[PDB]
Amino acid sequence: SHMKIGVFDSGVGGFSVLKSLLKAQIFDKIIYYGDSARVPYGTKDPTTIKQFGLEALDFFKPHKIELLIVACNTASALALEEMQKHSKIPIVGVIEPSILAIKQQVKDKNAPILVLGTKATIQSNAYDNALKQQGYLNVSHLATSLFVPLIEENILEGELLETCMRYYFTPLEILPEVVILGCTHFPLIAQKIEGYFMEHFALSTPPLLIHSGDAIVEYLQQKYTLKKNACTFPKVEFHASGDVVWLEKQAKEWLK
Amino acid sequence: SHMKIGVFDSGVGGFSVLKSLLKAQIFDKIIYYGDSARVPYGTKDPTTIKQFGLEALDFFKPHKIELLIVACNTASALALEEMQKHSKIPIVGVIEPSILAIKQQVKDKNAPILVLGTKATIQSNAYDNALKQQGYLNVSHLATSLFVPLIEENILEGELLETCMRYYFTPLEILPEVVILGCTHFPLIAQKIEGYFMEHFALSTPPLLIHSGDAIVEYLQQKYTLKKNACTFPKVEFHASGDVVWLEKQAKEWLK
Ligand SMILES: N[C@H](CCC(=O)O)C(=O)O
Numbered sequence A, B: 001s002h003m004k005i006g007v008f009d010s011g012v013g014g015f016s017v018l019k020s021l022l023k024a025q026i027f028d029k030i031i032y033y034g035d036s037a038r039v040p041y042g043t044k045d046p047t048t049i050k051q052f053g054l055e056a057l058d059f060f061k062p063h064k065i066e067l068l069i070v071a072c073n074t075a076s077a078l079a080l081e082e083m084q085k086h087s088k089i090p091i092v093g094v095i096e097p098s099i100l101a102i103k104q105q106v107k108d109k110n111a112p113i114l115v116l117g118t119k120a121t122i123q124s125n126a127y128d129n130a131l132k133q134q135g136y137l138n139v140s141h142l143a144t145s146l147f148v149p150l151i152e153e154n155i156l157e158g159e160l161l162e163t164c165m166r167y168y169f170t171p172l173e174i175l176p177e178v179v180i181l182g183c184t185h186f187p188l189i190a191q192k193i194e195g196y197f198m199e200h201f202a203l204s205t206p207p208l209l210i211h212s213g214d215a216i217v218e219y220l221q222q223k224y225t226l227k228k229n230a231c232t233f234p235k236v237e238f239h240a241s242g243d244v245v246w247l248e249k250q251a252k253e254w255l256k
């Protein structure tokens, strides 16, 4: 409520986290920056992504933010440690809050958990390592790269999404009880992913989906003793490396 | 057989143009630069893309090249004019040579022509304007954005690509006689596009496809009086804004 906060993402996907933040009404001043000139990060190499993350700090320096949310799971997996080393404010990414959500919500440490993410996020084993450190023993991972461009084309239903889901999911050995939506974009197809598993494995109830935005809202509420529903008319500024009007038009859609 | 040339693309797609160049054996020194940290360009805005094009000129400054090939159809569509104004050496893009190839190969100016490209290339109407100025009266265009990420995942066949072509091609009202592959990536699915139009319309021969790389080779060979097969062992150098080892590994596959 007092704190001026930053939200960093590679592009418009971070609006899924911003939506979660706004719904909770916990912050009163939010500065969003999407690196839309250079998105996606997920298909790129660690060196490049780490440098992207440091350059994001340069963007926020003049804004005098008191906390930075790295809404991007890819930048969280690859760049967050380096950004924190070179940062006088707290930087909170979206991986660790989801590990806490799993701890709270998934007491069966042998439940089959499936981590979905970009190629860079999955190849970093960020989630697998943190989950193993907390005793989870039945952890699978799957890079679902094409979900990102599909979702940015607003293809959230239909034959093409069903065939893409089939393409990525048919090779899975284990049926998951928990799916980690380890990418900003994947909340927009959360019901379709749930519907995919109910349809094809005769489930009555879908696996549990972990939403990165909801988990970080929960963590920040606890960590900063934030009253929910306290900030009903926040100030939100949008910034981008690409065209800002384009990014603002997409914000209108993602935050609806 | 002596000019030091540069080839610029947003990433690895420009290897389809490099393939055409190498086969023609017309140049002896080629400096390839892919902006792999920021690819794709085609989903981004004109201001961003124009500036990307000028920054490519900066990359090439120490290389002191004599001709720049803009292999990227998106940069050619949006950035070429400004780059040419800001350059003392000739810059050749991949749109105008394709207009020449159509003039040469398509004498019926009422032949239905379909331009396929990125969202930005199509929105620019670069192809339509040039075709119309040459008297072609039956020009349609179609942005097929998702072909790019599919192709970069090496998905060049199978039901996902078939479903993606149906998604983009089913709404077509005109059956093309000629299809312009107005994107670096689309040569890799050229047969699949040909096959699609023969099946869903029973053709006994496919629409004619225009390949950007072959069209620029033919143009350069006439413009500079270059003797094919003169340079059997060219020096080819790869540069990238992302990890250049990753880019070089993709070259091996695209140039095969
Ligand atoms: N924001 C990225 C998805 C888009 C990208 O690859 O940059 C993530 O959360 O993984």
Ligand SMILES: N[C@H](CCC(=O)O)C(=O)O
Residues within 6 Å of the ligand: B009, B010, B011, B013, B014, B039, B040, B041, B042, B043, B071, B072, B073, B074, B075, B117, B118, B121, B148, B182, B183, B184, B185
């Ligand atoms: N090189 C681009 C395709 C990839 C991109 O969008 O940057 C083109 O030829 O249009």
